[PDB]
Amino acid sequence: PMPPSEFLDKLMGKVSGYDARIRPNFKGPPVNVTCNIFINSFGSIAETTMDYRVNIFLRQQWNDPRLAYSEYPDDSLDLDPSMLDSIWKPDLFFANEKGANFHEVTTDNKLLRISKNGNVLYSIRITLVLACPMDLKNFPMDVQTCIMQLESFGYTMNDLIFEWDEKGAVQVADGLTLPQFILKEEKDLRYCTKHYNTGKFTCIEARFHLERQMGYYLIQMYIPSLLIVILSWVSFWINMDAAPARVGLGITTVLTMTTQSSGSRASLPKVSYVKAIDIWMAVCLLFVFSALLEYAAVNFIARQHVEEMRKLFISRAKRIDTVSRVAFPLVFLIFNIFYWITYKII
Amino acid sequence: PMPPSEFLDKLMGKVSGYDARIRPNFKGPPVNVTCNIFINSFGSIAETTMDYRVNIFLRQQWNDPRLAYSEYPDDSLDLDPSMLDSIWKPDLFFANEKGANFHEVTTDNKLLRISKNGNVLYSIRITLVLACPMDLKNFPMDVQTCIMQLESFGYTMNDLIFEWDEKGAVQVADGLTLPQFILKEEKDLRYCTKHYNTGKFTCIEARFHLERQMGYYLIQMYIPSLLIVILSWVSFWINMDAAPARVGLGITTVLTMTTQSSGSRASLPKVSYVKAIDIWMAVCLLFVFSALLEYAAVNFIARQHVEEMRKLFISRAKRIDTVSRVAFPLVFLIFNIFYWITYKII
Amino acid sequence: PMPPSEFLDKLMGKVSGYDARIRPNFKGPPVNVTCNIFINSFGSIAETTMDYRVNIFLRQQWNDPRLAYSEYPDDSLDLDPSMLDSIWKPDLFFANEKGANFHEVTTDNKLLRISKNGNVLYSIRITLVLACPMDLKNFPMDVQTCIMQLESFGYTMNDLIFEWDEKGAVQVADGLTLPQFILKEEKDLRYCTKHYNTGKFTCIEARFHLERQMGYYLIQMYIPSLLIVILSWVSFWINMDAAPARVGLGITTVLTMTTQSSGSRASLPKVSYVKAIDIWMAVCLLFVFSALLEYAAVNFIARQHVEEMRKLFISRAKRIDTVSRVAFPLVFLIFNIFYWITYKII
Amino acid sequence: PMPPSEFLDKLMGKVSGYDARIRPNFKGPPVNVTCNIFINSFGSIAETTMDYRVNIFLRQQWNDPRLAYSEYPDDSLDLDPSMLDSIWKPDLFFANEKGANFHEVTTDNKLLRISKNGNVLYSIRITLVLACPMDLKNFPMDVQTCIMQLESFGYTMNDLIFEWDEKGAVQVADGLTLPQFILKEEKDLRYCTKHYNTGKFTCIEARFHLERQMGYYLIQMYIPSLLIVILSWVSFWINMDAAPARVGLGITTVLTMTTQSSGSRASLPKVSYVKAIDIWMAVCLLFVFSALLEYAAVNFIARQHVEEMRKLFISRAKRIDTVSRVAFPLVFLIFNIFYWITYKII
Amino acid sequence: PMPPSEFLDKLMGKVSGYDARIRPNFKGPPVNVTCNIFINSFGSIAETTMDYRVNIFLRQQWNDPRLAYSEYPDDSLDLDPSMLDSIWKPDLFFANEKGANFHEVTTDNKLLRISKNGNVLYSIRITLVLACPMDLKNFPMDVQTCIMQLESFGYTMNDLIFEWDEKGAVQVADGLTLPQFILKEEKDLRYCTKHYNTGKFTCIEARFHLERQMGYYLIQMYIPSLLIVILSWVSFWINMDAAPARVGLGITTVLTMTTQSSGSRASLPKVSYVKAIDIWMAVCLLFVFSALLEYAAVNFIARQHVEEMRKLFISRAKRIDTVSRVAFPLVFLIFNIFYWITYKII
Numbered sequence A, B, C, D, E: 001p002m003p004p005s006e007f008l009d010k011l012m013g014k015v016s017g018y019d020a021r022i023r024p025n026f027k028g029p030p031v032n033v034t035c036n037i038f039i040n041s042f043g044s045i046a047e048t049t050m051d052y053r054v055n056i057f058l059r060q061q062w063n064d065p066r067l068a069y070s071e072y073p074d075d076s077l078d079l080d081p082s083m084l085d086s087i088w089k090p091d092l093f094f095a096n097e098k099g100a101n102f103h104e105v106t107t108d109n110k111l112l113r114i115s116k117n118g119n120v121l122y123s124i125r126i127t128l129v130l131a132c133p134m135d136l137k138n139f140p141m142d143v144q145t146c147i148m149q150l151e152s153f154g155y156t157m158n159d160l161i162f163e164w165d166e167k168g169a170v171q172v173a174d175g176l177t178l179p180q181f182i183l184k185e186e187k188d189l190r191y192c193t194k195h196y197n198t199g200k201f202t203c204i205e206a207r208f209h210l211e212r213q214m215g216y217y218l219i220q221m222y223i224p225s226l227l228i229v230i231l232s233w234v235s236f237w238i239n240m241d242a243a244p245a246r247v248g249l250g251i252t253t254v255l256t257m258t259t260q261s262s263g264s265r266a267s268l269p270k271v272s273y274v275k276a277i278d279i280w281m282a283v284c285l286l287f288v289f290s291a292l293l294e295y296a297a298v299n300f301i302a303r304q305h306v307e308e309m310r311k312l313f314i315s316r317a318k319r320i321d322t323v324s325r326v327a328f329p330l331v332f333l334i335f336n337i338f339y340w341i342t343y344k345i346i
């Protein structure tokens, strides 16, 4: 006899003086709530909004001496979420929620079991859209650090303390991959204790290091910006002194270079500073604009101008072509060395 | 006399000791819940978010010996959703919900009938937005496998086991078509039993094989990329040695080829690897860029340069034109053989 | 004396044995619920999602012999939605809901009146986002047929039957117009009785024939595609044998023709088959691409090439121009006859 | 003594026979509910959906003789929204809701006070997304008339009548401006009484005349369409008889004119008819396309062609240039007079 | 003994005559509620909608003499949100809500503590989407002032007065940064007392001065608009009297200048007036269009035209080139001085 749901209504009901509005160990030491999470889903990391969506299993463990049964033979008593509002629960929240919700499909997704000595496991499923500030100084090569922090709202430090457990405080699902990022295995765990004019409130947080996948931006933004500089080096071969087509190749490789420089920031926040994709576009814009300034310098030296003088201004307008045909694969190559050593090391 | 709604309140009410917070066969064998789904709607398969929306009829069948009436003459007793929170129900959920809801139009869309021996049918309507990781290595020719899995949240393996029924575990509606995909008839059914630090929980899943319709990408992305290579072969005929228009056709078929290569990935996730639509664009980019590098080689050989020597540099700059007029329909044709046999077989 | 709300609480309350969980005519003939709708709003007919939004007044009429009062002098008793969950209601739903909601502004928008013999009128306001598969074979000239179907969820055919009433089963508001479509006056009304593994369930449906307004696509997509073919016929007049500008007009009218062919499908689903707007773009793409292949054929015949021989290759390269200047207004006109007779008849 | 909340529970509670399900003046004259609104926010007037969002204070005043206290000394008794569902309220709704909601921040935003003679003031805050059909025949110069109508849902004309009050039936906030429109001060107030097959229901409505701000469309769409016609008049000066650049200026001013004609309708509904911005684009498309047909006519007359005959065809191909250089500032100016007098008067 | 939750149910329950529907100091002086906020998150400041999203901690302090306990030994009694609807609360709302919500993750995020003398602290977490009208006369250099105002809804001025506290009435989080703006430290605090036809209602508000970051618009919109003017100055060097390429550089630098002038207002509201980014685009449009009107003036003077007369029309068409090659770096530089002194001072 003695089923658990009838027995546990005796443990927390009208008799035995249990009050769900009062924390355990009242007028004594604070409640030590230890926590760990299990990340089911991760991603949709937007940058116009600067937020990310996570789907976690928030597990909470504390001790409640009023729920310590002694004569019931089992070791754990589950509690379905119909009677979930009948015991004490910590008032945990996230300091960067930006909208969140539970999951209530076919049953309230809430887990609650009570051990013999009073250890209470409390596991719920939460979908969060957490805010993290994006630092985009070196944009295709940055390592973002987006955090999540777990505060108390109504209980101060002298009544309720949050801790991480030592046995794997952040678990990650097995095949959890990201379309644009990779989640590094080392996850920092530190304190974030807040001081308001109301009091000091407990806080624990977990950093997540997000490294980008450079392989996408190496296809769309780097190679067509490297192919268009080779396209601007075709103008050094067309008719070798003067043409109406070297102007047509000098203009047109600045046009789509301006479009690709403007199209590279189509889905980005309007940040105040210069980033890594800017000084790849705004330096390769010089290598396609100096190729048209050269033909403007050739067509002014060649068409300026006797017998002796004919040997002068023709050998001077050919010296501009056959030297800058090789000098631009030296200036563009010495920048391409300097660009990647600056950013791949950082 | 004895109406069912008054009779069944005797079966589960205050008398007879029925408690909806306690599973059937308590302190005994686990509850064997068998399930099958009926897909009403399918689709809106996004790839930026990597998710799909489904609209199912979730049927659940278990046995409850406390609900086994004997003296009532009927074989089945329906139960409207007003008294739905009064019997035991399995706490099923989806491990990749990503937000979901019920349907509550004109009545809570819930079905519940109880047989004589205790068999309980439970059919509800759920709209899900399920997550599936997209593998886009061969993008217009891939066969996606998007899954859905049905776990328990509060009952472990020794208390509740999920199964698929043998009589058509996944039904599909009659005229259910997809705008971009086709749903294959063979649907895999296997186990996905999860191990956490709380316990081990039951899980059953059903795979759906989604094959794309290549007919859309054969019109927008393949034929204008095949027409623009024919457009670049017009330059082998214009004035046959030298023109200011062969540059104008050499530049311009790289411009919109760059735009079509960039516009082909307008609604795609920023994946790290190269896909099948990339190495169709980034190889046909060579066939429109080598056609301009040829005229840069023709205009350097023809305009380089006597009586005997005049026969040399004219017959040499015409040999470049009349051979590569036929060689490029050999190189582009030998790639076009190699590109489709690689991907249509896989 | 005897107010209705006090009298009707006697009619359905604890006394007289009324039970809102039991259908009328129990253990007898099925309940014949007759229905008609009033479409307030219609439209926002998307095609990427293939759905439409409607705003209806759902009226339901059935008979309930337990509500047949006799001695109260009035003919009808209204029932405000505070006591709405106290009588029986049919569990109607829509088989293609895709999310829906009620309207609860300043009062629950629900109407309920009870006649003397037991006739119960029940009118509620529902906003639906209904799904309909789009058939886009002849896209600017198609007649779409989007339906809505009204099923029962928990009551089978032997307990509850849906019917349309004979007195105008679908009413439409007076000034209801659509931005892209016109709603035809003939609305089909037929049965859609579903067979599941649970039972057979009643279903009635209403077809809505949606004919497009071709006047939008006649301005944006047809006239600039007809103007660009006239633009390609300008090249037959420029210098009459050879120019570096006939190449520039031959290239450029393929460029924006490719963009307009790609821009015409900017807000469309990725369907597997070819549609009517495709073979207007992909045939007028030939009339702007054959005009450049002609000048490539002229510049190869003119620049190929004596005294007698001079009369040959000049009269042959002029014969190509002065015949195809008139032949292309014959080939483009004989397609334009064949294109519209195929689609305006269907 | 005698606080209001204890006194008013006597006025509407179990004693005195008050029933909130029964309208005042029952079996008598209908209830005359007078209404006025206060528009806090207005705007976000979309045209793809053809709707606008408003944020109003809906005030309702009626008479309830059962709430007419006599011996309590005050003149008004406020009623907080905790007891809001305990007296009678009219079932007002909007016939063009398209989704709406209340505001429940820190308290249900509901006001309710009861005078001595029975006058009841009832003020709530509603956010509406109201539908209005857009008439876009003269699109940048139209005066839109978007309405809002307030019906009853359960009470017919012989039980409940809506009226506007004479003392400012529509108030507008002080600094309420709009980004694209201006709200005219004259607001029409008329009746909209509906007839259904259920009965006839009361309805009152208020028209809002919305005049556009033409200053935006005068910058983006009119001046670059007027600058590009001046750009097409540059071709009458370049080399004065024949050039390969007059073709290049003739083609290119049709290209971006086609893009600006297509880009002007980027965020507009797909209406069946022609509008005012169309016949500014589709007439200035002629003035940039006839300028290229002129050079095609010049290059056919000049290059057609003796001593006497040389004076003929040179003075004939120059007569085309020097007359149409001045005739096009006469034809484009006589249309520009005719265009604005047609639309600014209407 | 005497736990707080049992003691406080005596303080506000059935005994002691406490009524939560009645404000403190009834029939006396008004309730002086003092407020201060803590901005957690700020931003997503849209301009098409003209709104911003804030995430605040709304603290409210007032005095309630009915809650002034005397014999309980503690100084403050917390109150969890399960009993939150049992005492009096001010009916605060925001006059520009535009939709808002609470936060209910793992507990209702509400704080409530009661001191000994009756001081009641009440702190809740609210997410707001507040409306502010944008003034965009000088668009990249403006200082926006977006406000938030806190009114009462049901209590007039003679019953409830809102105030700001003197001890830091608006606190901001530590590392709160914005992607496009910076939040100035001086925050104005003034009154906004409203007068309706119902009464006069209290209101307090806080101004937030938002200054833009000009560094984004200095990269995308200013440098490619300054590079294209240098690109138009290349045409003064190409062949120095006449070319078919100076037309090709005169047309093309107007094309993308028109696109950049249209693309700069891609995500902006359709305002009626001219802004700062307009008269940078619409003046640099003149410097790229007058460079083509010069070559049309050169090609008409040079190609107009003896021995003496040959020296006239060649020295006249070269005087146009060599003077306007230096005059345009004087006119564009004297505007660039006048443009920034006008706007950076304001």
Ligand SMILES: *[C@@H]1O[C@H](CO)[C@@H](O[C@@H]2O[C@H](CO)[C@@H](O[C@@H]3O[C@H](CO)[C@@H](O)[C@H](O)[C@@H]3O)[C@H](O)[C@H]2NC(C)=O)[C@H](O)[C@H]1NC(C)=O
Binding pocket: A025, A029, A030, A031, A032
């Ligand atoms: C929750 O965790 C905190 C911190 O782990 C516990 O506080 C600690 O409690 C112990 C025993 O009450 C304290 O030790 C005591 O130290 C004092 C000198 O400070 C001395 O009288 C004894 O040596 C005694 O052992 C310890 O100082 C204290 N630490 C802190 C930081 O407060 C708390 O007891 C835990 N509460 C529960 C309910 O488990």
Ligand SMILES: *[C@@H]1O[C@H](CO)[C@@H](O[C@@H]2O[C@H](CO)[C@@H](O[C@@H]3O[C@H](CO)[C@@H](O)[C@H](O)[C@@H]3O)[C@H](O)[C@H]2NC(C)=O)[C@H](O)[C@H]1NC(C)=O
Binding pocket: B025, B029, B030, B031, B032
């Ligand atoms: C739910 O399904 C499971 C699996 O089908 C059932 O468990 C099975 O129960 C039977 C009978 O209790 C077990 O057979 C027994 O085998 C043992 C040796 O293992 C031996 O003493 C007898 O031969 C006896 O027949 C069977 O092993 C067991 N299988 C597993 C995997 O546990 C369970 O009974 C079902 N529960 C209900 C309520 O239907």
Ligand SMILES: *[C@@H]1O[C@H](CO)[C@@H](O[C@@H]2O[C@H](CO)[C@@H](O[C@@H]3O[C@H](CO)[C@@H](O)[C@H](O)[C@@H]3O)[C@H](O)[C@H]2NC(C)=O)[C@H](O)[C@H]1NC(C)=O
Binding pocket: C025, C029, C030, C031, C032
């Ligand atoms: C709801 O509507 C259905 C169909 O209109 C009604 O069913 C019909 O009921 C009548 C009278 O009970 C049946 O007529 C009977 O026919 C049998 C032979 O079939 C014979 O014994 C008599 O001639 C008798 O009149 C009729 O067959 C039956 N039709 C069907 C398709 O079932 C039903 O009665 C209606 N229920 C209510 C509550 O109005």
Ligand SMILES: *[C@@H]1O[C@H](CO)[C@@H](O[C@@H]2O[C@H](CO)[C@@H](O[C@@H]3O[C@H](CO)[C@@H](O)[C@H](O)[C@@H]3O)[C@H](O)[C@H]2NC(C)=O)[C@H](O)[C@H]1NC(C)=O
Binding pocket: D025, D029, D030, D031, D032
């Ligand atoms: C609500 O407003 C309506 C309309 O303003 C009121 O109806 C009006 O009531 C008066 C007095 O009952 C009627 O006057 C009567 O006219 C009849 C001839 O029609 C004659 O016997 C007398 O001369 C008498 O004065 C008036 O006709 C009637 N008007 C309409 C259109 O029905 C109604 O009484 C108001 N109800 C309340 C509760 O204020």
Ligand SMILES: *[C@@H]1O[C@H](CO)[C@@H](O[C@@H]2O[C@H](CO)[C@@H](O[C@@H]3O[C@H](CO)[C@@H](O)[C@H](O)[C@@H]3O)[C@H](O)[C@H]2NC(C)=O)[C@H](O)[C@H]1NC(C)=O
Binding pocket: E025, E029, E030, E031, E032, E161
């Ligand atoms: C809430 O705050 C208001 C304003 O701070 C308080 O109103 C003020 O109350 C005091 C004392 O009742 C008034 O002083 C009195 O002035 C009159 C002449 O006006 C004279 O008889 C005495 O000199 C007396 O001190 C003061 O005028 C009044 N101010 C206003 C603007 O009304 C109110 O009492 C506060 N309520 C609570 C509950 O704290």
